[PDB]
mmCIF file of C-alpha atoms in Angstrom:
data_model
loop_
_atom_site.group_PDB
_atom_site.id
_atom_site.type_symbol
_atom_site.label_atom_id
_atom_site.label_comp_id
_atom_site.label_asym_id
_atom_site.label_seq_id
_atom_site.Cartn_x
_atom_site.Cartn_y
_atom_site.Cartn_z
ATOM 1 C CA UNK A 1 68.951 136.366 -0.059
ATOM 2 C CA UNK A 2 65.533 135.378 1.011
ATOM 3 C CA UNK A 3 62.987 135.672 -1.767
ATOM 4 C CA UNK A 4 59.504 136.134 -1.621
ATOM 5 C CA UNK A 5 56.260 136.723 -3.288
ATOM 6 C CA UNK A 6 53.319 137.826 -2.909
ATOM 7 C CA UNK A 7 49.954 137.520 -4.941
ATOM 8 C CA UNK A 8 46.742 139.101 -5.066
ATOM 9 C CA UNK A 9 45.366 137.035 -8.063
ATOM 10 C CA UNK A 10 42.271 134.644 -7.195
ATOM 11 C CA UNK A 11 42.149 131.707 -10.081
ATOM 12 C CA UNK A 12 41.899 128.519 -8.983
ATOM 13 C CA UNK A 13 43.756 127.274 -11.449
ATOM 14 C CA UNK A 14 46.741 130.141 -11.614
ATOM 15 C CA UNK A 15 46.716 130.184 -7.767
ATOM 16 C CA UNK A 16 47.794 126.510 -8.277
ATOM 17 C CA UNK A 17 50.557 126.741 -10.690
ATOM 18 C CA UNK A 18 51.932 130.027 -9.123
ATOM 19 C CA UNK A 19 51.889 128.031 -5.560
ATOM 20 C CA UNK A 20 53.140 124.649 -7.406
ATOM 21 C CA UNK A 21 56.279 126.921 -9.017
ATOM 22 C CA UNK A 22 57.610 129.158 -6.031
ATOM 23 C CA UNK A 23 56.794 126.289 -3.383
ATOM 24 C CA UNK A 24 59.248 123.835 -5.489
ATOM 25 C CA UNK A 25 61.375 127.725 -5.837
ATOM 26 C CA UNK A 26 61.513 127.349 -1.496
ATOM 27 C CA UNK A 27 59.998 130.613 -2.250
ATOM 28 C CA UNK A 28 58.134 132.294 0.824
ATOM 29 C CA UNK A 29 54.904 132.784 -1.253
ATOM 30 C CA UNK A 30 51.962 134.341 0.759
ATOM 31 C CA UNK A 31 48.603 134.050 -0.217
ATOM 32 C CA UNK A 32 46.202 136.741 1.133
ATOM 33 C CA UNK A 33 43.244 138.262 -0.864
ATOM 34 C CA UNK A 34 42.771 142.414 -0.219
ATOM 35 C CA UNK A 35 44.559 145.119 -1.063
ATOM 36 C CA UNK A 36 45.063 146.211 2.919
ATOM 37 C CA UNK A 37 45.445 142.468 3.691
ATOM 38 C CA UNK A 38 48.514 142.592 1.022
ATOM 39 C CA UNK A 39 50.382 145.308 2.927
ATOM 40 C CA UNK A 40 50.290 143.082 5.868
ATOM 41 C CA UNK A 41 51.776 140.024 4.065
ATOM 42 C CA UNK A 42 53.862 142.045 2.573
ATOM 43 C CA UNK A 43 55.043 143.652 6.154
ATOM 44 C CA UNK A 44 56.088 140.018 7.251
ATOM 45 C CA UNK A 45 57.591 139.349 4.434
ATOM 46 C CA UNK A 46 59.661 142.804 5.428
ATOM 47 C CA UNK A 47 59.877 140.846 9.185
ATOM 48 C CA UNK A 48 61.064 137.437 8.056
ATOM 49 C CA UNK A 49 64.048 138.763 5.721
ATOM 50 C CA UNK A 50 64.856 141.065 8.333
ATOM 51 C CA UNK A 51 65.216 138.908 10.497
ATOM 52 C CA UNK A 52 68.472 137.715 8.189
ATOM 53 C CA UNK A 53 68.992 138.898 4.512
ATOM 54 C CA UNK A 54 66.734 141.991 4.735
ATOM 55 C CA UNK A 55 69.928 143.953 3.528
ATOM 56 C CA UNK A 56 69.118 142.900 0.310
ATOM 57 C CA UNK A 57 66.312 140.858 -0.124
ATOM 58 C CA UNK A 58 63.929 140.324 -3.421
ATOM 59 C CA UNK A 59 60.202 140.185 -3.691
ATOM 60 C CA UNK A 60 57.352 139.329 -6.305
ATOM 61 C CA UNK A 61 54.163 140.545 -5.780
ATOM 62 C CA UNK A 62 51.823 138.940 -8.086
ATOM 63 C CA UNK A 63 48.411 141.139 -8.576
ATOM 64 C CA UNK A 64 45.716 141.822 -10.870
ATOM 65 C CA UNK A 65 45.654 145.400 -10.897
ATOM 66 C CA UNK A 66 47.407 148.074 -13.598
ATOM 67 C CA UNK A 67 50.830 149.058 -12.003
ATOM 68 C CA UNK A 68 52.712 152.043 -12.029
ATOM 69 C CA UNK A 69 56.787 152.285 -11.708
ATOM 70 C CA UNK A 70 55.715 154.570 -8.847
ATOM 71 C CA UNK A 71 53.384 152.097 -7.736
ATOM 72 C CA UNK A 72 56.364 149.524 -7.267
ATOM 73 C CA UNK A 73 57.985 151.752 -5.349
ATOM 74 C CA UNK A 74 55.358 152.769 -3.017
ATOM 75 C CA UNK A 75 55.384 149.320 -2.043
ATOM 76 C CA UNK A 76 59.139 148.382 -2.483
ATOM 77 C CA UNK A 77 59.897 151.704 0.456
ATOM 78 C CA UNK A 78 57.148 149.928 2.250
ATOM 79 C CA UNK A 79 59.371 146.581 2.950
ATOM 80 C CA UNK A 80 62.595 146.715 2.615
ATOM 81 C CA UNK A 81 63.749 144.687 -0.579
ATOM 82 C CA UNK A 82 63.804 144.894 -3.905
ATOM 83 C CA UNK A 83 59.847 143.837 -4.526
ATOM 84 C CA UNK A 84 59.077 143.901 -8.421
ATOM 85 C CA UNK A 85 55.462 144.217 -8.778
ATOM 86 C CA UNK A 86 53.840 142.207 -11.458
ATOM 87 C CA UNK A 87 50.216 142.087 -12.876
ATOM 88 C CA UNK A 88 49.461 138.682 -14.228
ATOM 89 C CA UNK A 89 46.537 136.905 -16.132
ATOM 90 C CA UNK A 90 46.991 133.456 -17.185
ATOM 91 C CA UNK A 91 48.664 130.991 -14.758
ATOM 92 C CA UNK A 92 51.524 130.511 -17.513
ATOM 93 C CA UNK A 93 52.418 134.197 -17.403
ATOM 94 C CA UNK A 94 52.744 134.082 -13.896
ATOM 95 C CA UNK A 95 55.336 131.093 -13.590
ATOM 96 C CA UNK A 96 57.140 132.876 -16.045
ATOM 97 C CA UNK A 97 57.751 135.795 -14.049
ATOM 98 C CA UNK A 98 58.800 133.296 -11.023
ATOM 99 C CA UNK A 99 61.168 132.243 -13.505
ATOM 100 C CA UNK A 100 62.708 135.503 -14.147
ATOM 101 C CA UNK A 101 62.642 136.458 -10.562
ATOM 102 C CA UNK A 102 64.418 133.549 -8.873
ATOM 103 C CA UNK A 103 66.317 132.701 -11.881
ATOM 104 C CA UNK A 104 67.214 135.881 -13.412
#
């Protein structure tokens, strides 16, 4: 199961701890800033795990925007996986949803 994550969250700081947390995870985190730019990071991350484990694959998308269940989805029937969208704000909150993504 290859697990990745995405972010769209620019703090120096956070950007470091969420990088620091998924890189020691072997997670295949890809930082891009734009909403468009997302979908393509988000597409190879659809193209790398398809390449093997797409069957069933999990993501984390880490953004700073208000999400909607529906909003998940949108983007979850956009690569296939299992991505679990996730709007963060201080870099603590954001290793702690690395933790209960890779170690749920």
């Amino acid at each position: 199961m290859t697990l990745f994550v995405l972010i769209l969250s620019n703090d120096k700081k956070l950007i470091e701890e969420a990088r620091k947390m998924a890189e020691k995870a072997n997670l295949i985190l890809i930082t891009v800033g734009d909403e468009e730019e997302l979908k393509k990071a988000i597409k190879k991350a659809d193209d790398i795990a398809k390449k093997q484990n797409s069957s069933e694959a999990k993501i984390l998308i880490l953004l700073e925007k208000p999400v909607s269940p529906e909003y998940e989805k949108k983007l979850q029937k956009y690569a296939d996986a299992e991505v679990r969208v996730r709007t963060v704000t201080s870099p603590d909150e954001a290793k702690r949803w690395i933790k209960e993504f890779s170690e749920e």
